[PDB]
């Protein structure tokens, strides 16, 4: 072995408040795969024994030794996760006494190449030869450290355009809030009305064409909204004894998505039915059965009261308090939703076994095949989804696999269970081939009960919709257009009134699908941390065409319901539920901290928040979060409808708990470190 | 973000051909988890505002910035895989003008910690403060760069012992080969006879006690030899129409393992039946059925001829030519073995479906449950095995998971399929509760045929045994005791004669279990490359107690045949075959190159052999290897016994092909880079 001396030092960003800009040599579309070839081409561009000195193996270039660059500059940032390097660019420096004049070469690679440990996705290489080099390297790093400038340089097609862009960039670098009634809605409408034509024509016309990306994301959204829509329709049919069918769920989802895409601010939010909504509909069905009330009328009245409360919240600008919402409560809610998905799948398979395996109406074969198909669908979907994080696959391959993991698994296992195992008939969701509910035919006592239930549902809707909207409107997503929280809530209430009046299932912003929609509609910079791909969004196109097309396709899918879309057996839908439950915990810090018990704290990155905070306080915070999650499960997953209807109240209550009690029992600094 | 300047430079290993050795301060068993605490303790040991200067965030220690060490020295090596850093230690340097005298502090951490990207397993931190620092840091790095010296320092218990060890280490650092008949056997016997008592007492007595490690590895070996032994016994019973039972396979494996452990050199090699051996036994059964020859007599004669040829090879010292063996041929053979395992599992499940699902004697339920159990066993075993590579799990946790993955999966799914699904009876391996074969009652023509078949089997045995022995005797394993190839081959021939005379299935060195046995019986230094744990063996204990105990336990397991060990259904054994097939390709470079078509070449480390070699030549080599593998599969996996009996010949032929033809069509430099 050979000893290596690594020296790290800061460099102040150049303060612009040039000759080498024009004298720089630009290489575009470099197809070389190795560092040696790229550097040889870059050096030849100047006009060789000069490439050898660039690395540590200076003096013994023939013998096989460690081949590492000597002087490099990169962008670095500090975060709770650790030290994140800017791996999209690299600046190599070489001070050669033989040379007489400074030389600068900027090379843009066709594909991101792995130039080092923290430079796994380098696309720009800035080689600076000097006869100092420090000043030129610093100024070029300062110019290249901008996230948008790198994308602008990527968009350039010619060397002259590259130099002009560089010159242009250098020159350029040189309480009581709720008192106003309806202020938030008016502000959101004013913000998002002028930008509306652009939403339709962002990528259709202009310098950048997004037709292919728009089509691909439209297909993604259509599939990822239809398949969960079918699963939720089947679940509701099982829960409501056929009151809400799969056809009703599909129609409601299509209408709601179309209305939201057409007439909402922040169109990137996707409306879909959720597991807690199914649980609450089950609560309504149980109450109606107990009190002999018509399901349709009671459901319509509950939806009407929920929409009324949501409109009251929107008009009074309550959404602002959602700024106090922290990540811990969000992750607790997400884990509860995943647990509800898992329990729905388990209940479905248990019912299948009870009806078929135990003969409580060849049933054993059907039950075993159902279990096998559900587990296999889950496994295949999870594997195809996790292939997205592989840093060695082509970007196209690992974005198609992410895009078409669940659809591929569903199709493959539907074929397996309907053609490979056609001799074993199994369960399929009901389909009997939209009348307004008789709201007037209901007692006043039932109206008051619906009022209370709608209040609880409105709290649930407020929390969920604002959570997903905040996720979509995160600062790291780089959304130029303004936010629309109150107008979005009002439109959600309106469309929910419309859906409830016709008995269609309720819908709100979908947590798993909205960030996925944003990512599919965004340009990202690949980052490799611990051997996994992480995406840094640079530009989101922010168009309504994708959501509108997805909604229209989902609506048109009603014609494929009888003959197609029914060969998908119920166990495939349960596997879809399981896949959603597992894949909704990708960035869950609560799950990470829970697993930390089985992991090694010292194993985490030196500057990781886990290693920074004492393990005792981390465990205390995890225990408090787990206690909150257990209490949420206890109320919101019991057999008692009267106590299953209360879980929105405790969802509201956790926010005051996190805001008040936890800082009193846990130090504020540690909570700030963990949450951020 | 803040620009970072990384400077890399060589440092010549100190040439010893001291005061600071004695003046150094030693800290032992440091339980601190963060770098700040560890260094604060080290600085306090001298006797604070000095810890801040050690990192790049000098001048702004309060504001949250990137917290990286400034000057660090570590051990680095170059390999075809890439640049491998010595992560087991770090040297931190600080030149402070305030200080008046040099200071050195050596801290040993209780557990390995992550101190950076390439310092993921740091156990020794050497901090050098200077008022130069370069000389002291270089000499300490040179002393610590030794792999065995780090283990010796770990073994020390007191500061005085640590200093004495440091001082002692510093002082210390200051053709025609086959003509002799039987020379190899005599040399091996002379080499490995004096060391024989030590083999029994390596860890039992002395400074280091290995009782716990010996017990754990004995349990691992017992389970990993019994379960595949049962699977192979069932496969042979299916193939040979009950001629070779599971009881016979267990007895033969136990006797052979005991004999090999007792009276062989290099006892770390594990003898077990293999898939090609099962295929060849099937060939023998088919030939006997075709020619109406007694299976036992023909099998015994074939084994006798195979042993005679193996003894001839051992006495004439042919094993030496195995040095010409390359990694490409080894990996082709391993992939062929895995494919044979997969086809055996597929044939078993196809037969189960044909008998039960199609009723060609509730069968559909049994077939579907068989498929589900096999797939689930494969999945669980693979997951528990792959958890071994997680860099965040505790070393004990991942070591146990690797040790008890297959046994845990087998037990869990046997319980599931025998208790959870007890209503669905399914296939179980035959067991009817050891007579010498009537060799004298066989025709001369059958004797000549058995001679030819035994010649082919002897070539197969030579290749397989020498391959596994070379894997066990790899230089990187650090085996102090000498190698024994010819004596091992002679003993293998003797025990094979003994086994064949009684009709027991043949056995030779097991490729998947011998390296695993070595690893379980070895101390390793953890390395994290691309987020995966890689082990560097420092010391292998090299004892026969583990293999002897495993063989004795396997033999004693015959008493657990009737009531235990039969609830394991055949699909569990097929899942075991699949698990072995998938887990035998961990380091397979042929599989890596085949998958490279779907991967990105530029995403590999800069110094990886994949990027160094042009992709065209990599693809040509992969295509040639795949063609050889396809020919091997075609000959050794067809329905014709006369052509299924020839695959050992082409296994032999592939070595001349690799040695002669490939260098002619592929450049020698690229082949050397890829193979090494």
The CA distance from B638 to A500, in Å, is 65
Task: Tell whether A532 is within 8 A of chain B (Cβ).
Answer: yes
Helix axes A295-315, A444-472, angle to 10 degrees: 50
Count of alpha carbons within 13 Å of B560, Cβ hemisphere only? 13
Residue ranges with strand state E in A114-251: 122-130
The CA distance from A367 to A349, in Å, is 8
Cβ contact B84:B527 at 8 Å: yes
How far, rounded to the nearest angstrom, does the alpha carbon of residue A438 sit from its chain's CA centroid? Answer: 40
Task: Tell whether A616 is within 8 A of chain B (Cβ).
Answer: no
CB distance A606–B67 less than 8 Å?
Answer: yes
**Min CA distance, B606 vs chain A (Å)?**
6
How far, rounded to the nearest angstrom, does the alpha carbon of residue B346 sit from its chain's CA centroid? Answer: 26
Residue of B nearest to A369 (CA): B368
3-state secondary structure of B639: coil
Residue B187 neighbours by CB under 8 Å, 6+ apart: B486
Provide, as residue numbers in chain A, all residues whose Cβ is less than 8 Å from the Cβ of B612: 34
Closest alpha carbon to A353 in A426, A423, A279, A418: A426
Residue of B nearest to A424 (CA): B364
Closest alpha carbon to B542 in B562, B517, B571, B577: B517
3-state secondary structure of A281: helix
Residue of A nearest to B121 (CA): A603
Resolution of the structure in the document, Å:
3.0
Bridge partners for A537 per DSSP: A524
The CA distance from B499 to B304, in Å, is 10
Structure determined via: cryo-EM
Closest alpha carbon to B601 in A349, A493, A114: A114
- Which CATH superfamily does the domain covering B19-173 fall into? Mannitol-specific EII; Chain A (3.40.930.10)
The CA distance from B9 to B352, in Å, is 64
3-state secondary structure of B244: coil
Task: Tell whether A359 is within 8 A of chain B (Cβ).
Answer: no
Q: What tokens were used for A473?
A: 């409107």
CB pairs under 8 A between A and B: 252
**Min CA distance, B241 vs chain A (Å)?**
30
**CA torsion through residues A601, A603, A606, A607, sign:** negative
Residues 406-445 of B with CB under 8 A from A: 421, 423-424
Task: Tell whether B294 is within 8 A of chain A (Cβ).
Answer: no
3-state secondary structure of B410: helix
Q: What tokens were used for B669?
A: 């430099």
What are the distances in angstroms from CA A444 to CA A290, A293, A440? 17, 12, 10
Dmax (CA) for chain B in angstroms is 96
Task: Tell whether B514 is within 8 A of chain A (Cβ).
Answer: no
**Min CA distance, B317 vs chain A (Å)?**
35
Other beta carbons within 10 Å of B178: 16
State the DSSP code for A54.
Answer: G
Q: What are phi and psi of B118, to 5 degrees?
A: -105, -5
Cβ contact A127:A161 at 8 Å: no
Task: Tell whether B33 is within 8 A of chain A (Cβ).
Answer: yes
Intra-chain end-to-end CA distance of chain B, in Å: 41
Other beta carbons within 10 Å of A440: 6
3-state secondary structure of B114: coil
How far, rounded to the nearest angstrom, does the alpha carbon of residue A543 sit from its chain's CA centroid? Answer: 17
Cβ contact B117:A8 at 8 Å: no
State the DSSP code for B599.
Answer: B
State the DSSP code for B437.
Answer: P
Torsion, Cα A139 A144 A145 A146, to 10 degrees, reads: 120
Residue ranges with strand state E in B555-613: none
Cβ contact B43:A178 at 8 Å: no
**Min CA distance, A633 vs chain B (Å)?**
28
What are the distances in angstroms from CA A551 to CA A90, A251, A491, A594, B620? 43, 10, 16, 38, 49
Residue appearing with tokens 């004795």: B552
Count of alpha carbons within 13 Å of B404, Cβ hemisphere only? 9
Where do breaks (C to N over 2.5 Å) occur in chain A, by preceding residue number?
Answer: 17, 47, 131, 174, 361, 433
3-state secondary structure of A567: coil
The CA distance from B491 to A98, in Å, is 68
The CA distance from A19 to A227, in Å, is 59
DSSP-derived pairing of the beta strands A2-11 and A83-95: unpaired
The CA distance from B535 to A565, in Å, is 50
What are the distances in angstroms from CA B499 to CA B40, B365, B472, B508, B589? 66, 40, 24, 12, 35
Residue B352 neighbours by CB under 8 Å, 6+ apart: B366, B367, B370, B426, B427, B570, B571
Cβ contact B289:B551 at 8 Å: no
**Min CA distance, A212 vs chain B (Å)?**
23
Other beta carbons within 10 Å of A610: 24
Cβ contact B227:B576 at 8 Å: yes
Torsion, Cα A339 A342 A346 A352, to 10 degrees, reads: 140
Closest alpha carbon to A522 in A213, A223, A265: A213
Q: What tokens were used for A205?
A: 């016309």
- Choose the closest CB to B8 out of A56, A392, A530: A56
Closest alpha carbon to B90 in B45, B43, B38, B50: B38
Enumerate helices (H) and strands (E) in chain B, giving the number of each.
26, 10
**Min CA distance, B246 vs chain A (Å)?**
29
The CA distance from B594 to B629, in Å, is 12
Closest alpha carbon to A288 in A238, A340, A241: A241
Residue B672 neighbours by CB under 8 Å, 6+ apart: none
Q: % helix / strand / coil in chain A, to the nearest 5?
A: 60, 10, 30
The CA distance from B74 to B85, in Å, is 7
CB distance A371–B372 less than 8 Å?
Answer: yes
Other beta carbons within 10 Å of A443: 11
- Report the run of H or E that residue B366 belongs to, with start and end: helix B363-386
Query: Whats the size of chain A, residue-wise?
Result: 676
Residue A296 neighbours by CB under 8 Å, 6+ apart: A243, A437, A438, A503
Provide, as residue numbers in chain B, all residues whose Cβ is less than 8 Å from the Cβ of A120: 603
Cβ contact A102:A22 at 8 Å: no
Cβ contact A266:A488 at 8 Å: yes
CB distance B421–A114 less than 8 Å?
Answer: no
Closest alpha carbon to A210 in A578, A437, A472, A544: A544
Burial of A63 (0-12, 13-18, 19+ CB in 10 A): exposed
Bridge partners for B599 per DSSP: A393
Q: What tokens were used for A400?
A: 């198609």
The CA distance from A454 to A645, in Å, is 10
Bridge partners for A509 per DSSP: A271
The CA distance from B207 to B188, in Å, is 28
Burial of B551 (0-12, 13-18, 19+ CB in 10 A): buried
Task: Tell whether B37 is within 8 A of chain A (Cβ).
Answer: no
Domain layout of chain A by residue ranges: 19-173, 183-585, 588-676
State the DSSP code for A508.
Answer: E
Provide, as residue numbers in chain B, all residues whose Cβ is less than 8 Å from the Cβ of A138: 3
Task: Tell whether A349 is within 8 A of chain B (Cβ).
Answer: no
The CA distance from A379 to B380, in Å, is 12
Residue A59 neighbours by CB under 8 Å, 6+ apart: none
Residue A71 neighbours by CB under 8 Å, 6+ apart: A92, A93, A94, A95, A133, B5, B6, B7, B8
How far, rounded to the nearest angstrom, does the alpha carbon of residue B23 sit from its chain's CA centroid? Answer: 44
The CA distance from B251 to B259, in Å, is 12
Residue appearing with tokens 């340097």: B93
Helix axes A486-501, A183-192, angle to 10 degrees: 100
How far, rounded to the nearest angstrom, does the alpha carbon of residue B411 sit from its chain's CA centroid? Answer: 24
Enumerate helices (H) and strands (E) in chain A, giving the number of each.
27, 10
Residue appearing with tokens 């509730």: B362
Other beta carbons within 10 Å of A207: 5
The CA distance from A250 to A227, in Å, is 10
Burial of A212 (0-12, 13-18, 19+ CB in 10 A): exposed
CB distance A10–B5 less than 8 Å?
Answer: yes
Residues 373-392 of B with CB under 8 A from A: 375-376, 379, 391-392
- List the single best residue of B39, B67, B392 to mutate versus A (max A Cβ within 10 A): B392
Provide, as residue numbers in chain B, all residues whose Cβ is less than 8 Å from the Cβ of A116: 606
The CA distance from B385 to B372, in Å, is 20
Task: Tell whether A3 is within 8 A of chain B (Cβ).
Answer: yes
The CA distance from B361 to B234, in Å, is 19
Cβ contact A339:A594 at 8 Å: no
Torsion, Cα A614 A617 A623 A626, to 10 degrees, reads: -80
């Amino acid at each position: 072995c050979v000893l290596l001396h690594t020296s790290r030092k800061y460099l102040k960003l150049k303060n612009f408040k040039d000759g080498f800009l024009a004298q720089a040599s630009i290489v575009l579309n470099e197809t070389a795969t190795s560092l040696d070839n790229v550097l040889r081409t870059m050096l030849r561009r100047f006009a060789d024994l000069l490439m050898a000195m660039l690395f540590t193996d200076a003096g013994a270039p023939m013998r096989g030794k460690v081949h590492l660059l000597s002087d490099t500059i990169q962008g670095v940032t500090a975060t709770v996760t650790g030290v994140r390097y800017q791996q999209s660019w690299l600046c190599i420096i070489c001070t050669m006494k033989a040379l007489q004049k400074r030389h600068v070469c900027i090379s843009r690679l066709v594909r991101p190449q792995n130039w080092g440990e923290n430079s796994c996705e380098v696309r720009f290489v800035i080689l600076v030869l000097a006869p100092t080099a420090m000043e030129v390297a610093r100024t070029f790093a300062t110019m290249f450290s901008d996230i948008a400038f790198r994308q602008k340089l990527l968009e350039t097609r010619t060397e002259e355009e590259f130099k002009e862009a560089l010159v242009h960039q250098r020159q350029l670098l040189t309480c009581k809030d709720f008192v106003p009634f309806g202020k938030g809605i008016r502000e959101d409408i004013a913000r998002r009305f002028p930008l509306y034509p652009l939403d339709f024509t962002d990528g259709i016309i202009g310098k950048n064409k997004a037709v292919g990306k728009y089509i691909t994301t439209t297909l993604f959204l259509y599939f990822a909204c239809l398949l969960p829509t079918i699963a939720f329709g089947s679940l509701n049919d099982e829960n409501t004894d056929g009151a809400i069918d799969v056809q009703k769920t599909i129609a409601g989802q299509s209408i709601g998505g179309l209305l939201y895409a057409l007439f909402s601010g922040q169109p990137l939010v996707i409306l879909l039915t959720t597991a807690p909504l199914a649980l609450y509909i089950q609560v309504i069905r149980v109450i109606c059965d107990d009190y002999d009330l018509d399901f349709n009328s009671f459901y319509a009245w509950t939806g009407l009261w929920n929409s009324f409360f949501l409109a009251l919240y929107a008009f009074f600008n309550l959404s602002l308090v959602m700024s106090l919402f922290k990540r811990s409560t969000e992750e607790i809610i997400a884990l509860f939703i995943s647990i509800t998905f898992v329990l729905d799948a388990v209940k479905g398979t248990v019912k299948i076994f009870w009806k078929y395996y135990y003969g409580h109406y060849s049933g054993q074969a059907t039950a075993v095949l159902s279990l096998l198909i559900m587990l296999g669908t889950l496994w295949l979907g999870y594997t195809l989804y996790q292939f997205k994080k592989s840093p060695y696959l082509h970007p196209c391959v690992r974005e198609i696999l992410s895009d078409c993991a669940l659809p591929i698994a569903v199709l493959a296992f539907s074929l397996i269970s309907s053609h490979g195992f056609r001799e074993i008939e199994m369960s399929k969701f009901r389909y009997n081939p939209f009348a307004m509910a008789q709201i007037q035919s209901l007692s006043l006592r039932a109206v008051s009960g619906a009022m209370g239930l709608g209040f609880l549902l409105s709290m649930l809707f407020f929390i969920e919709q604002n959570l997903v909207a905040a996720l979509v409107n995160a600062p790291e997503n780089r959304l130029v257009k303004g936010t629309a929280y109150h107008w979005d809530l009002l439109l959600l209430a309106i469309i929910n009134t419309g859906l409830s009046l016709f008995g269609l299932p309720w819908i709100h912003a979908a947590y798993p699908h909205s960030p996925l929609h944003v990512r599919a509609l965004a340009l990202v910079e690949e980052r490799v941390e611990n051997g996994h791909i992480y995406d840094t969004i640079v530009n989101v196109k922010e168009t309504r065409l994708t959501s509108l097309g997805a909604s229209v396709l989902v609506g048109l899918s009603l014609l494929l319901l009888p003959v197609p879309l029914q060969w998908i057996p119920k166990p495939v839908l349960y596997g879809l539920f399981l896949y959603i439950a597992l894949t909704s915990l990708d960035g869950n810090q609560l799950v990470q901290r829970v697993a930390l018990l089985l992991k090694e704290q010292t194993a985490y990155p030196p500057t990781h928040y886990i290693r920074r905070v004492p393990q005792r306080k981390i465990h205390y915070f995890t225990g408090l979060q787990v206690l909150q999650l257990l209490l949420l499960c206890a109320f919101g997953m019991s057999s008692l409808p009267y106590m299953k209807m209360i879980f929105p109240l405790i969802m509201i209550a956790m926010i005051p708990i996190r805001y008040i009690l936890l800082p009193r029992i846990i130090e504020a600094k540690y909570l700030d470190v963990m949450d951020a």
